[PDB]
Ligand binder design. Structure first.
Ligand SMILES: Cc1c2c(n3c1CCN(C(=O)[C@H](C)N)C[C@@H](C)[C@H](C)Nc1cc-3ccc1C(N)=O)CC(C)(C)CC2=O
Length: 208
């Protein structure tokens, strides 16, 4: 298990997201679904030039899986996935500028729901999650688990759990007071409001 410091700008953003009073937390789900959709767009595009990129799975979809026993909501996609370099360095490097602009825009009167316009919508997960785990598999690399409970650090390790084939799972370990996001009616409501036109099937799993 390797431990890394977040880019300073990203630690600042995470603290802002955790500390700012902002009741409209439900927008986190749209941002995660958007990342999944963009990841699915990318593998679809790449597979046109190279059909073998779907050898790791032809199905292009998004699953939403609540688990009340574990107090987790997982967003699963069969998109392009992320390499180790993406997880550790590359996406966060790119996200530095967006992070800075967002925080500047908030100082000027924007609100937290506009986060996705700055390319850092992933971090909205911390509106509702105390810990986020990202399990991901890209065709060119092994399966990795990224994890952070904020506090300025994240970890990456090779994942020895069930092989995914290709794609990304974002596991939200929900805060004690955010369990409404495990309720079928609540998730259905948010998906219809903010994510009704996503171009891949979204399956909301129900609890046994
Ligand atoms: C930024 C950012 C970040 C993450 N994703 C993105 C978002 C980075 N990104 C974009 O902002 C695009 C260019 N608008 C490319 C996406 C789509 C990429 C391939 N897949 C993806 C990425 C993210 C989340 C889910 C998925 C996922 N579910 O696959 C996750 C992590 C690297 C742990 C931290 C972080 O800074």
């Amino acid at each position: 298990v390797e431990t890394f410091a977040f880019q300073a700008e990203i630690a600042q953003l995470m603290s802002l997201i955790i500390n700012t009073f902002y009741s409209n937390k439900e927008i986190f789900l749209r941002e995660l679904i958007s990342n999944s959709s963009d990841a699915l767009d990318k593998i679809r595009y790449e597979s046109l030039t190279d059909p073998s990129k779907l050898d790791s799975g032809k199905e292009l979809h998004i699953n939403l899986i609540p688990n009340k026993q574990d107090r987790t909501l997982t967003i699963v996609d069969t998109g392009i996935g992320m390499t180790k370099a993406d997880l550790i360095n590359n996406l966060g490097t790119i996200a530095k500028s967006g992070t800075k602009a967002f925080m500047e825009a908030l100082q000027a009167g924007a609100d937290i729901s506009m986060i996705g316009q700055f390319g850092v919508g992933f971090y909205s997960a911390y509106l509702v999650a105390e810990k986020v785990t990202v399990i991901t598999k890209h065709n060119d690399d092994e399966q990795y688990a990224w994890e952070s409970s904020a506090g300025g650090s994240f970890t990456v390790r090779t994942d020895t759990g069930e092989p995914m084939g290709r794609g990304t799972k974002v596991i939200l370990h929900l805060k004690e007071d955010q369990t409404e996001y495990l309720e079928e009616r609540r998730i259905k409501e948010i998906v219809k409001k903010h994510s009704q036109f996503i171009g891949y099937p979204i399956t909301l799993f129900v609890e046994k």
